Structure formats: structure tokens, C-alpha cells
A paper describes a structure:
We report the structure of tDGC from [name], an important enzyme for the large scale enzymatic synthesis of c-di-GMP and the first [name] domain from a hyperthermophile. We expressed and crystallized a domain of the TM1788 protein from [name] (248 residues, WP_010865403) spanning residues 82–248, hereafter named tDGC. Cellular levels of c-di-GMP are tightly regulated by the opposing activities of diguanylate cyclases (DGCs) that synthesize c-di-GMP from two GTP molecules and phosphodiesterases (PDEs) that hydrolyze c-di-GMP into 5′-phosphoguanylyl- (3′-5′) - guanosine (pGpG) and GMP. C-di-GMP synthesis from two separate GTP molecules requires dimerization of two active [name] domains, with the loops bearing the [name] motifs of each monomer brought in close proximity to initiate the cyclization reaction.
In order to understand the structural determinants of tDGC thermostability and to investigate the catalytic mechanism and feedback inhibition of this biotechnologically important enzyme, we crystallized tDGC (i) in an active-like conformation with two A-sites in proximity, and (ii) in an inactive conformation, with c-di-GMP bound to the I-site. A comparison between these two structures enables us to examine potential conformational changes propagated between the I- and A- site upon c-diGMP binding to the I-site. In conclusion, our study identified a dimeric active-like conformation for a thermostable [name] domain, where the relative orientation of both active sites is compatible with c-di-GMP formation. Using the tDGC active-like dimer as a guide, we were also able to propose a 2-fold symmetrical dimer conducive to GTP cyclization with a nucleophilic attack by the 3′ oxygen groups of the ribose. Further structural and enzymatic studies are now needed to confirm this model. To investigate if c-di-GMP binding at the I-site causes conformational changes at the A-site, the structures of the active-like and inactive dimer were compared. The backbone and side-chain conformations are closely similar, suggesting the absence of signal propagation between the A- and I-sites, upon c-di-GMP binding.
Author numbering: 90 to 239
Write the structure that this text describes.
């Protein structure tokens, strides 16, 4: 597990997530893969130091975990990237999930009375439509996040 946030890492998101995809295949369920980029860590790190940036990451991680199911997967994909696997999702409920996830990551983190906030950008991929494996789905979600901010 990621030492800073305690969340599963990139390696673990795959080991876990690939099994969920195999389960969804058997159960005839859909799985939604969210790629979350957080903007604003460069400014926090440059101004206050990497340790304040790490406190922001830790609080944001805890907040997201508390707002998704314990059966869903939240991983620290990279430095300022998070990946979320939502098991047994449907298109009709997506808008509500995105609003909940965006509002949670957008909440300021009070670090010694300074109000530090990051800006989330989310890309979505859907299993089985967007791919057979988690590597494929993540690339689709990542590219969608990239193309929307252009
Ligand atoms: N994997 C995953 N799927 C999610 C998650 N959030 C919502 N869904 C999916 O979206 C459906 C509708 O969500 P809702 O509008 O919040 O509508 C929900 C909500 O109002 C309530 N609900 C169910 N569980 C919880 C919960 O643990 N906490 C809260 N506050 N409400 C819950 O019951 C309604 C119906 O729930 P469901 O039949 O299960 O139907 C849920 C479920 O299939 C999620 O965090 N992870
Ligand atoms: N709007 C909405 N939010 C959802 C949904 N599913 C999960 N969440 C969010 O994710 C948090 C953690 O879900 P959990 O791990 O299943 O942890 C849940 C779950 O174990 C249980 N719980 C609450 N409501 C339901 C429910 O309606 N059905 C079942 N089976 N369990 C529930 O209590 C724990 C804490 O619930 P919360 O405090 O509500 O905290 C929930 C809620 O903020 C949902 O379908 N709709």
C-alpha cells in the first residue's frame, strides 16, 4: 500500500481491479473506471513546501475513501493522480457519482489556518464498452480527461 495515503498503489489497483472485471464479466455487470487528476499541487509545493502538499493529499485521500463504497477501489495512481473503480454502476447514476466525487476533492484542506484547495479533473471509462482489461480502460479514462481540458 501507498505509504503516504495508506491507499492501494498502481500495482494493487491492477491486481484487485482485474479480478473485479472478471467478476463483472461473469455477473453481467458494468464497472466504471474514473481517472482523477488534481491540479494545484505545484503551487502548494512551491509556496508551502512538499510536506504541506503531502498533508493535502492525505486529507483528500481520507475524504474520498469515506464517500465511496468499501467494496469500490480507490488507489493513488501517481503523485497527484487517483483512480476509482466503481463496481456495478449504470450510466443513469453517473452524474450523481461525479458530483459527489468532485465536491469531495474540491473541499479545502486547512493546513495551519491556510485554506489549501486542489482542482479535480475526471475522465471516465466503462467496462465492457471501452475495453477488456483495466490497462485499456485506464488509458481511455486518462485520454478523456486530457481531451476535455484542451
Ligand atoms: N459501486 C457504487 N455504486 C454506487 C455508489 N453510489 C451509488 N451507486 C449506485 O447508484 C445507484 C443510485 O444511487 P443513489 O441515487 O445515491 O441512490 C441510493 C441512495 O439514496 C441510497 N443509498 C444506498 N446506499 C447508501 C449509502 O451507503 N449511503 C447513503 N448515504 N445512501 C445510500 O439508496 C439509493 C439506492 O441505492 P442502490 O440501489 O444501491 O443504487 C445505487 C447504486 O447502484 C457507490 O458509491 N459505489
Ligand atoms: N448517495 C450515496 N452514497 C453512497 C452510496 N453508497 C455509498 N455511498 C457513500 O459511501 C460511503 C461509504 O459506503 P460504504 O462503505 O458502503 O459504508 C456504508 C454502508 O456499510 C452502510 N450503509 C449506509 N446506507 C446503506 C444502505 O442504504 N445499504 C446498505 N447495504 N448499507 C448502507 O453504512 C456505511 C456508511 O454509510 P454512509 O455514512 O452513508 O457513507 C457512504 C456514503 O457517503 C450510495 O448508493 N448513494
Amino acid at each position: 500500500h501507498d505509504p503516504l495515503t495508506g491507499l492501494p498503489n498502481r500495482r494493487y489497483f491492477f491486481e484487485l481491479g482485474n479480478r473485479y472485471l472478471d467478476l463483472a464479466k461473469r455477473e453481467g455487470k458494468k464497472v466504471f473506471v474514473l481517472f482523477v487528476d488534481l491540479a494545484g499541487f505545484k503551487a502548494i509545493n512551491d509556496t508551502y513546501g512538499h510536506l504541506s502538499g503531502d498533508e493535502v493529499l492525505k486529507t483528500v485521500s481520507k475524504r474520498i475513501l469515506d464517500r465511496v463504497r468499501r467494496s469500490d477501489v480507490v488507489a493513488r495512481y501517481g503523485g497527484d493522480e487517483f483512480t476509482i473503480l466503481l463496481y456495478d454502476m449504470k450510466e443513469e447514476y453517473l452524474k450523481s457519482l461525479l458530483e459527489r466525487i468532485l465536491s469531495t476533492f474540491r473541499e479545502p484542506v486547512r493546513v495551519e489556518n491556510k485554506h489549501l484547495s486542489v482542482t479535480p479533473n475526471i475522465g471516465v471509462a466503462r467496462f465492457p464498452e471501452d475495453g477488456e482489461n483495466l490497462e485499456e480502460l485506464l488509458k481511455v479514462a486518462d485520454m478523456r480527461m486530457y481531451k476535455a481540458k484542451e
